[PDB]
Amino acid sequence: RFLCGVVEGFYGRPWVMEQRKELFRRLQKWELNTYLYAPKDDYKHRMFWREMYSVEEAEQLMTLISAAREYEIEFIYAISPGLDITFSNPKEVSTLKRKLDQVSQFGCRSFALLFDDIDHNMCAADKEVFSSFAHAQVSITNEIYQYLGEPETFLFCPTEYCGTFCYPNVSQSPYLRTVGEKLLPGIEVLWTGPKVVSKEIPVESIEEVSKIIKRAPVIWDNIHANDYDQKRLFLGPYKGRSTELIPRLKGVLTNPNCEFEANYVAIHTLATWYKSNMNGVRDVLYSPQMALKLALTEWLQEFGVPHQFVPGPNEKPLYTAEPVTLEDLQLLADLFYLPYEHGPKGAQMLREFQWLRANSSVVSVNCDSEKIEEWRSRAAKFEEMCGLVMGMFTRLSNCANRTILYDMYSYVWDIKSIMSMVKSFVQWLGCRSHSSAQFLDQEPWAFRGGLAGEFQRLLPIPLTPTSKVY
Amino acid sequence: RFLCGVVEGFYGRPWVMEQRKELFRRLQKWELNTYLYAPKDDYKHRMFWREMYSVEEAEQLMTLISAAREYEIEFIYAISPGLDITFSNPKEVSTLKRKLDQVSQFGCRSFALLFDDIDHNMCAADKEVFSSFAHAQVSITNEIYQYLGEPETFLFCPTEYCGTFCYPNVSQSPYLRTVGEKLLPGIEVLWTGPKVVSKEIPVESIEEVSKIIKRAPVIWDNIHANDYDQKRLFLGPYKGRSTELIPRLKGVLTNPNCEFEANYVAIHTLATWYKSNMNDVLYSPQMALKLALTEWLQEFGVPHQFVPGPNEKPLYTAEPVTLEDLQLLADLFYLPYEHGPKGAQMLREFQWLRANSSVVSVNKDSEKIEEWRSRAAKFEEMCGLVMGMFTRLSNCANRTILYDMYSYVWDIKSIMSMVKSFVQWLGCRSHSSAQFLIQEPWAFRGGLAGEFQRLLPILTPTSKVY
Secondary structure (H helix, E strand, O other): OOEEEEEEOOOOOOOOHHHHHHHHHHHHHOOOOEEEEOOOOOOOOOOOOOOOOOHHHHHHHHHHHHHHHHOOOEEEEEEOOOOOOOOOOHHHHHHHHHHHHHHHOOOOOEEEEEOOOOOOOOOHHHHHHOOOHHHHHHHHHHHHHHHOOOOOOEEEEOOOOOHHHOOOOOOOOHHHHHHHHHOOOOOEEEEOOOOOOOOOOOHHHHHHHHHHHOOOOEEEEOOOOOOOOOOOOOOOOOOOOOHHHHHHOOEEEEOOOOOHHHHHHHHHHHHHHHHHOOOOOOOOOOOHHHHHHHHHHHHHOOOOOOOOOOOOOOOOOOOOOOOOOHHHHHHHHHHOOEOOEOOHHHHHHHHHHHHHHHOHHHHOOOOOHHHHHHHHHHHHHHHHHHHHHHHHHHHHOOOOOHHHHHHHHHHHHHHHHHHHHHHHHHHHHOOOOOOOOOOOOOOHHHHOOHHHHHHHHHOOOOOOOOOOOO | OOEEEEEEOOOOOOOOHHHHHHHHHHHHHOOOOEEEEOOOOOOOOOOOOOOOOOHHHHHHHHHHHHHHHHOOOEEEEEEOOOOOOOOOOHHHHHHHHHHHHHHHOOOOOEEEEEOOOOOOOOOHHHHHHOOOHHHHHHHHHHHHHHHOOOOOOEEEEOOOOOHHHOOOOOOOOHHHHHHHHHOOOOOEEEEOOOOOOOOOOOHHHHHHHHHHHOOOOEEEEOOOOOOOOOOOOOOOOOOOOOHHHHHHOOEEEEOOOOOHHHHHHHHHHHHHHHHHOOOOOOOOHHHHHHHHHHHHHOOOOOOOOOOOOOOOOOOOOOOOOOHHHHHHHHHHOOEOOEOOHHHHHHHHHHHHHHHOHHHHOOOOOHHHHHHHHHHHHHHHHHHHHHHHHHHHHOOOOOHHHHHHHHHHHHHHHHHHHHHHHHHHHHOOOOOOOOOOOOOOHHHHOOHHHHHHHHHOOOOOOOOOOO
């Protein structure tokens, strides 16, 4: 019995009910089994955790819970009271019971209390009653677990939810020692690995934490989360998590991109990883590369589905003729790959452009043959690759599935707009030994990224135009 | 008779029907009168301009046209065939007629042909028939204008839509000379000023273009457009266009932020500007901003109890969004070529602190050091105002407004938090051995796009993400 699935647990615009229902269908299809409702900014889940749902909201939740049951997906209702609950007040604890009990009357049998991203400071009244922040949390979590009839699945998200957050380290944390000792053993605890967004989750980091919390954790995986950086998106495969973790874990619930339709790879490849070693104990089962191909091959089929003039040899050919290919998606994913890694093709373009720039002088004076025919042929290879990015954009912009397009638009627009400008600059580097033109005062580009961008930059890390915005 | 209003004319996720209806209400309330339907990526407007609307799409457009009429707003249906059309083929010109006549059967009496953002290259068959790109455009525009009964309002968007796009300049462009000469005089021409996103639209730039096109243009204003840069948003006032342009113009239609609810300031201040000299002395950008923000505020407390003791945990949700929070948010996301007073100020203070950083990284020059400390503390407090702004907005009852703006407000507060941290660290340099970043997200900020952009020519802070 292993919880594998998705947690809607990020900041910003939550998913709407139609999308949650569609998620359940995808989860079932890929043989996953769990959804955890935890959208940080759905107002009645965290900020206003005290308010009961209205009649309409109640009707929408009942329908959603029914849809989970119909798709053989376990629906886990989480709540996040940690920003302002007075833990020692029994009127507050009753409010929390009332809320959760309203939800069980919607049909829900699984629950969670989340204490992620809050400070350690307690109010005066809670310090009189509890000796540490952990004691207060564990107390109300135990009291709520028991009030709900000790449900088969109840989750707890600690404030120290990753290696780096544990004062002073994982294995001596007083916060986690208390959680391990006092949190009832039927309750499961959530963990995100060594960091908030863990590049790898090694087996020993999980043995280490399993010992102080005294169970195998459920992983809350932020690998594909993109709420922390406006320009980023993650389409690369589930990676850096050994199939050997599966027997050492109670589950994995991935918290992925905000943009719903961008999560085809993230969820599909998680499912391939789980299925690969569903029944192992205490030979190379999962290949990230092969799983990416499986997922992109299957994602492609959705682009032609919504959600006969033929011009002569002399006439204007159809702008719309060419559909999105598999090679376009392999490329898109390599440009928007993983949090600590660009995909092979993007890393390559970046490396070639760095090289062209630092060897730029070779081509700005007057013929040095062997170095020069190297630069020209790498520069032409690079110009062709920039052309593949524009093609990828152009064909996506024409696909029949507009819902997928809109979710990804601003990302694909951004990369193609920047590759177009990079290509232009490489072209200009190759004219320096005969063109007098300079490259480019004030258009959009002087202010790129807005005010945020200016601060970020000051910290430690028949003649077509140039002045095109669109 | 002057067309003033909004054009939904940007790239990306278009507005949905509920939002367009709500726009009409806002337009009416602020005494504007025109909407121009032109969403670049609504598929049947440009890419697939040839396809007729389905029964459902047809029903939705009839409803929307009815709503425009009900709110005393002129609905102008635009279409953009320029990527694909063979101009010389009469089957193609007929397809275009069929499309537009389906739309007039929805109730629409006003139309537009847009040729923005396409190349000048014609196919072989069109060069046999037309001597220039302009001739071909003007021909089908005139043919369509006449077929529809020479309707009162018909617009044309040229390919050379701004000063910088005119080869070789505005006043000698063969493309614009042809447009001025041959485009029927009842048809109106769209223009965006000296540039795509014009900082100013001076009076003479409009006299200059008015003479070669031989009428007063309608302005298509991209001042507040934000489709060209993922991280940007514009909440500052309508600025850089004199009230004296009004008599020299047939209208102004603003193409604003993609995020619907962000356009409260952009549209309200445009309306204040028009009203000021319907028939700079008359209009103050600053005063117009205040008017619009004070009225915008009222929407935040509206959607779309336990009282803790002196000992107990105080409500996280207690403090509502203030007027001072919105003035600050707007100053951080102001205009395309200008930050608002408060953001320019924070930037200037932070630049100063950084370049005088050395003063505090050694030790006996007292007056310069007590200057740095007190400016550094003043700056730390201002970074705190940005976090306040964020946390109160994140608690407001109008969730629709919040969601439209969330990732921008999150981004600024997340960066000010990191800037503040760095200023704190600069003031420990004369005793702390700690380095700034000891990777986590920050090494890869902006993604691959960010790394290319950087190479073109001009509880720990790394560890906490949220």
